Structures are given as C-alpha cells and as structure tokens.
C-alpha cells in the first residue's frame, strides 16, 4: 500500500530521457538484504544538490525506526535507485 | 490536498460528538493521519494517530479511553469519536496528513485542516 | 524529548534575523518539525526533518537540530512572517509540540 508509493516515485525518477539522477555523484552501494530501507538512507544522506530525490528521501525515512544523519563499491545514484527499485518491487510479492 | 472536518459544535460534560474530516487530493490510504486541537488562545496538543501502515493507534494521555479515531479508506474520512467529553477538551479540532510508512512519526505531519469548533460546558 | 521549551515570545524588526530556539532533552536525537501559525488560519509546515524546506516555502527559514537545542532561523524577517511558531517532535508514541513562540516583526 505504502510500498508502491515509494516504487512508484522511485519509478518516476528513473524515467527515460531525462538528466542523470543527481548529475554524476555517486554513493556507496549496499547488499538489498534486510535493512534495506536504513541503508538506503544513510547512503543518499550526503547526496548535495538535488531536489529530485528529496521525495524519496522523506519517504524511505517512514520505512526506518531511527534518525539518520559497508563500504566495497561507489556507484551512481541513478544506478543506486534501479538497484533497489528492483529489490522492492520483488518484496511487493 | 484537502481536509475538510465537520461534527463540531455545543456539546455538554459527558455527552459525546463524533468529528469528520474528509480528505482529497492524494492516496490517503497510504498515509497515516492525526488530530491535533488547539484550546482558545493556547498552544497545539497533539490528540490521536491512525497508522497508514498498521491499524495501530496512538493517544494523548489526556484522552485516552475516551477518544476513538478511526478511518475509512473507500470515502477518504478520518473520524473522532469524543465520549466522556470534558471543559478541558473545547478547542478547535485540526485533521493532519500524517506521516508514510510504518514509522509514519519519523516522516512527519503535512497539511493541516481548517479545522471545527468544539464547546464543551455545562 | 518529553517536554519542548521554547521562549514566549521574540521581537525583531524588518530585515532582521530571527532565531527561535526549541530545547529538548536529547532533542537531538530526534527529528525535528516547526510549524507556524499566522493568526487566524492553521498551521502550516515550514521544516521537516531537521533542516528541510517543504515545497512553497519561503527560502529565508532554515532549521538546525544539534545537541539538546532545535533552532529555527528567519533570515531577513518580512512583515508577513509575524506568526506563532511550533516545534514538535515525536517520544514515547505521541507527538509532542514545544510550548510556542509569538514572533513580533515590528512594522
């Protein structure tokens, strides 16, 4: 119910031709496992200068019991939103 | 986005009113909602919670036991059923677009209603 | 946390900055919201989240959420910023608001 909102607006910022999310800034990529949504956050938490994803933003932080504020590959933030807009559609069973 | 309360008016201690607030605008099913009233000339009180997430519910210690909020998602409408009312609950009675998720209190509250009156005296 | 003090009221005049402060233990820990209220309408969010501006909000508010204290901050006050403003904050599953503060924009 909540989640689609959240894939749906993941979904319109991964939309074809436009500018690549959040010019070329690149965050750390996480294993879509458990936690996914508090990880997701404080990986998107230092992205500067991007209001596109600032509805995201606020809307993973209903999904995380605490206030934010592993680290093996950097990858782009428009790579970073598909990665996980396919992990939370699988979870919409 | 719109909240349209209505229920308010002149009520006795003891006696009951049952608020409305019909909500357009956005997919209300999605997001949890709140009252907040405010007494004459003082501050806001935050007064009960309804999940968008769980059917989990949230009180003030003021009213609890005596407050029931409730939602029905097919008319967009949030409810307050107000028994045991008393003087120290006449305020104007705001709805608010709560928060998504299921730690909707982490997204925070959105738009406010206009909101309804409510009197309650002797 | 619990229990939101924030000073009754605070007076500046037009183009001044006006610093509303919201004291909270552990506040910090929290996010924080601020709501103002111009006199006779309802309330409408003006920071979310510590910092955050909603959409349609004046570029001349910001917030800041350190320590115990959350701040909110107008920068060139206008006349038509004279409102009362609230902090809140969510503990112990409930809403909690801060006490207000009446912001006089001498004109």
């Known amino acids: 119910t909540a989640l689609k909102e959240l894939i749906e607006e993941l979904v319109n910022i991964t939309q074809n031709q436009k500018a690549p999310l959040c010019n070329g800034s690149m965050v750390w990529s996480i294993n879509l496992t458990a936690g996914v949504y508090c990880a997701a956050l404080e990986s998107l938490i230092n992205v500067s200068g991007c209001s596109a994803i600032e509805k995201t933003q606020r809307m993973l932080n209903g999904f995380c019991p605490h206030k934010v504020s592993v680290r093996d590959t950097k990858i782009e933030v428009a790579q970073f939103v598909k990665d996980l807009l396919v992990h939370l559609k699988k979870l919409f069973r | 986005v719109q909240l349209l309360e209505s229920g308010g008016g002149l009520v006795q201690p003891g006696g009951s009113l049952r608020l409305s607030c019909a909500a357009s605008?956005?997919?209300?099913?999605?997001?949890?909602m709140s009252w907040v009233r405010q007494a004459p000339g003082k501050g806001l009180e935050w007064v009960s919670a309804?999940?968008?997430?769980?059917?989990?519910?949230y009180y003030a210690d003021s009213v609890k036991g005596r407050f029931t909020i409730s939602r029905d998602n097919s008319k967009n409408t949030l409810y307050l059923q107000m028994n045991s009312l008393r003087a120290e609950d006449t305020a104007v009675y705001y709805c608010?677009?709560?928060?998504?998720?299921?730690?909707?209190?982490?997204?925070?509250?959105?738009?406010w209603g206009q909101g309804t009156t409510v009197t309650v005296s002797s | 946390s619990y229990e939101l003090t924030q000073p009754p009221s605070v007076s500046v005049s037009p183009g001044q900055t006006a610093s509303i402060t919201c004291s909270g233990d552990?506040?910090?820990?929290?996010?924080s919201f601020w709501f103002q209220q111009k006199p006779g309408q309802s309330p409408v969010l003006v920071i979310y989240?510590?910092?955050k501006r909603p959409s349609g909000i004046p570029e001349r508010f910001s917030g800041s959420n350190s320590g115990d204290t959350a701040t909110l901050t107008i920068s060139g006050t206008r006349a038509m910023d004279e409102a009362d403003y609230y902090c809140?904050?969510?503990?112990?599953?409930?809403?909690?608001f801060g006490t207000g503060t009446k912001v006089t924009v001498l004109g």
């Open positions: 608010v677009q709560d928060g998504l998720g299921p730690y909707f209190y982490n997204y925070g509250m959105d738009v």
């Open positions: 605008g956005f997919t209300f099913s999605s997001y949890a």
């Open positions: 309804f999940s968008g997430w769980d059917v989990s519910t």
């Open positions: 552990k506040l910090g820990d929290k996010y």
């Open positions: 989240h510590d910092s």
């Open positions: 809140q904050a969510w503990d112990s599953s409930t809403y909690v």
